């Protein structure tokens, strides 16, 4: 599936030792056609009580509740998507929703209200690529000493590093990685071209770490 493909793609680049080239030509691996459509722009870890709330770059909001269910509010402010633990999806609206979801809608709004007003948008300067097509939800997440790892249902894996605020957005369908550096500049690369042309030690180190993180996701 997506994670197995991502692992293969990362291993292939990492095995090639991209930073150890005679002449690294990192810029030759850039491909703006592979810029992602979706990534996580902000998040709140309230997992001691309710779960993890997050906002995607399209200003939609989601919550992965502690009971392994998900509720998504589209950026129109009314459309909802509810995903049961099985993955069973239901579409509804805030204006017309079963009373059984009132509590979870209320929790999502508390998350939304906080995030719209008070957190920075990751990738605020990134224009998504032109698309056609499905809104993803948060499948899994965890935190380590160095990063928070966010796995979306479209296969994308996002890794936000705590120390220096650098970020990776990995897509196994594009076989691409977007790297946001500490200055918030960003580049999108085709992983196969990073294997061909190489890259700096900073990006190579984060791609080695990313492979370790995908191993963790695979082990659930």
């Amino acid at each position: 599936c997506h994670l197995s493909d991502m692992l293969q793609q990362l291993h292939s680049v990492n095995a090639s030792k991209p930073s150890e080239r005679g002449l690294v030509r990192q810029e030759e691996a850039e491909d703006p056609a592979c810029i992602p459509i979706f990534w996580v722009s902000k998040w709140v870890d309230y997992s001691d009580k309710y779960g993890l709330g997050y906002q995607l770059c399209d200003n939609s909001v989601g919550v992965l509740f502690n009971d392994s269910t998900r509720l998504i509010l589209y950026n129109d402010g009314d459309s909802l998507q509810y995903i049961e633990r099985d993955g069973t999806e239901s579409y509804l609206t805030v204006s017309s929703h079963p009373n059984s979801l009132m509590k979870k809608i209320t929790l999502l709004k508390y998350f939304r209200n906080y995030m719209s007003e008070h957190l920075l948008k990751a990738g605020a300067n990134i224009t998504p690529r032109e698309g056609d097509a499905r809104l993803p939800y948060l499948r899994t997440w965890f935190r380590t000493r160095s990063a928070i790892i966010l796995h979306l249902s479209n296969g994308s894996v996002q890794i936000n590093f705590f120390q220096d605020h650098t970020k990776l957005i990995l897509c196994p369908l594009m076989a691409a990685v977007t790297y946001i550096d500490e200055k918030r500049d960003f580049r999108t690369y085709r992983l196969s071209l990073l294997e061909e042309y190489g890259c700096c030690k900073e990006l190579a180190s984060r791609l080695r770490y990313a492979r370790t993180m995908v191993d963790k996701l695979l082990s659930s």
Partner: peptide, 5 residues
Amino acid sequence: PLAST
């Protein structure tokens, strides 16, 4: 609770 940047 923890927050993004």
